[PDB]
Amino acid sequence: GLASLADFPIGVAVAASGGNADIFTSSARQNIVRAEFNQITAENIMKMSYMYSGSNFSFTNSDRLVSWAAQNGQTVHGHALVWHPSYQLPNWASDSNANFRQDFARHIDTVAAHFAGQVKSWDVVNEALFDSADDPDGRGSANGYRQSVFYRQFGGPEYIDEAFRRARAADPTAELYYNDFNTEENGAKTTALVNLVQRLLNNGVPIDGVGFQMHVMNDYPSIANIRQAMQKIVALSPTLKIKITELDVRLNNPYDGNSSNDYTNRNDCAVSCAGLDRQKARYKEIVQAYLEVVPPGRRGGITVWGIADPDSWLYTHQNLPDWPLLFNDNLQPKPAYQGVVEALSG
Ligand SMILES: [Ca+2]
């Protein structure tokens, strides 16, 4: 399968919260993971709050998944040690908590140490950069940084440095990533990423690599821009690794000012449409750009954000249907799958 075609991780996000996508219940999904991939990311159950039950740490459910991975030929990318969204904040992660810095330290020290030897790499900090599309509280930019509870408590971006240093100390063997989205657009956020990563390097922070989520559409952003954004980050350091962490590809672009090039019906791309064929080319050109500009020895992996289309967080988005992944609703490989094969094989 796909993983055989590369010497770096070829991964997939797996569900474990019930319903049809749940990896523990779906033998068909289990079989795809074993045959095609050699790494998993937990789609949800390694987020911050999932490390607790009531007031105590609780690793039961995440240990089950990490063990499943080890028994079925998968390494694990941990997602994520520090991330702002309130649906996954531990209760300690509040401006009302005088003990915040102590509880932050305890979180990273405990979680990183717990998974040592079982988890290959981590998203240490995810989504520290400001994004206008993603600022529901209206706090605004602090010179490109998101003013999350971590930023507010630490009074600035020093929480990022601390998270990396603590993760390194707790598990010296893990590869430590900074992860974000929209940084492949080669616009304002890419610039803010350069500033963020340069500051960490200047401070001697133990960052091992940068993750690009790569939640893209079929035609936007341009492959030239994706390629140049990656190049800009590769150029910051002779060793910094690059990982594509959450790749998926929407056929529909609701942001293009054109409502006549949208597939509006679930039947449109059930069998065949121009969009599925472009999606093949799109997966292919992105994997090719990754290979061309990320040197051998610095390729941290490529991961797709789920197994089959109905499992995708983007199966519906902006009130439209979509088909974002490598396998269809009946778990059959799509043209997208072949695009990855062709890229990885040259
Ligand atoms: Ca459109």
Collapsing DSSP to helix, strand or coil, 196 comes out as helix
DSSP category for residue 145: B
Q: Could you tell me the distance, in angstroms and rounded to a whole number, from the CA of residue 171 to the centre of ligand 1?
A: 46
Method: X-ray
Collapsing DSSP to helix, strand or coil, 330 comes out as coil
Q: Which residues contact 31 (CB under 8 A, 6 or more apart)?
A: none
Range of the domain at 209: 1-346
Resolution value, angstrom units:
1.5
Could you tell me if 82 and 136 are in contact, meaning their C-beta atoms sit under 8 angstroms apart? no
**Is 246 an annotated catalytic residue?**
yes
* Helices assigned H by DSSP within the chain: 27-36, 60-71, 100-114, 149-154, 158-170, 188-202, 223-234, 274-293, 335-345
Please name the helix (run of DSSP H) or strand (run of DSSP E) that holds residue 326, with its range, or none: none
Q: Which two tokens stand for residue 296?
A: 């051998």
Q: Which two tokens stand for residue 35?
A: 């045959």
Q: Could you tell me the distance, in angstroms and rounded to a whole number, from the CA of residue 254 to the centre of ligand 1?
A: 4
Q: Could you tell me the distance, in angstroms and rounded to a whole number, from the CA of residue 261 to the centre of ligand 1?
A: 5
**Is 36 an annotated catalytic residue?**
no
**One-letter amino acid for residue 173 of the chain:** T
Please name the helix (run of DSSP H) or strand (run of DSSP E) that holds residue 329, with its range, or none: none
Work out the angle between the directed axes of helices 188-202 and 223-234 (0-180°, nearest 10): 10
Q: Report how far residue 156's alpha carbon sits from residue 207's, in angstroms, rounded to the nearest whole number.
A: 18
Q: Which of 222, 338, 344 is nearest to 280 (CA)?
A: 338
Q: What's the sign of the alpha-carbon dihedral 272, 274, 276, 277?
A: positive
Q: Could you tell me the distance, in angstroms and rounded to a whole number, from the CA of residue 250 to the centre of ligand 1?
A: 11
Task: Dump the DSSP string for 1-48.
Answer: -GGGG-SS-EEEEEB-SSSTTBTTT-HHHHHHHHHH-SEEEESSTTSG
Number of domains the chain contains: 1
Q: CA 74 from chain center: how many Å?
A: 17
Q: Could you tell me the distance, in angstroms and rounded to a whole number, from the CA of residue 259 to the centre of ligand 1?
A: 5
Q: Could you tell me the distance, in angstroms and rounded to a whole number, from the CA of residue 325 to the centre of ligand 1?
A: 19
337 to 15, 64, 181, 251, 326: CA distances (angstroms): 20, 29, 22, 15, 5
Q: Could you tell me the distance, in angstroms and rounded to a whole number, from the CA of residue 251 to the centre of ligand 1?
A: 9
Q: Could you tell me the distance, in angstroms and rounded to a whole number, from the CA of residue 263 to the centre of ligand 1?
A: 9
Given 246, 285, 292, 342, the catalytic residue: 246
Q: Which of 139, 110, 114, 245 is nearest to 183 (CA)?
A: 245
Q: Which two tokens stand for residue 49?
A: 């709050």
Quote the Cα angle for 219-222-223, to 5°: 110
Q: Which two tokens stand for residue 14?
A: 């797996």
Given 127, 158, 285, 292, the catalytic residue: 127
Q: Report how far residue 284's alpha carbon sits from residue 337's, in angstroms, rounded to the nearest whole number.
A: 9
Q: CA 99 from chain center: how many Å?
A: 30
Q: Could you tell me the distance, in angstroms and rounded to a whole number, from the CA of residue 100 to the centre of ligand 1?
A: 44
Q: Could you tell me the distance, in angstroms and rounded to a whole number, from the CA of residue 218 to the centre of ligand 1?
A: 11
Q: Could you tell me the distance, in angstroms and rounded to a whole number, from the CA of residue 113 to the centre of ligand 1?
A: 46
Q: Report how far residue 76's alpha carbon sits from residue 33's, in angstroms, rounded to the nearest whole number.
A: 12
- What is the domain-level CATH number for residue 86? 3.20.20.80
Q: Report how far residue 218's alpha carbon sits from residue 253's, in angstroms, rounded to the nearest whole number.
A: 8
Q: Report how far residue 249's alpha carbon sits from residue 72's, in angstroms, rounded to the nearest whole number.
A: 27
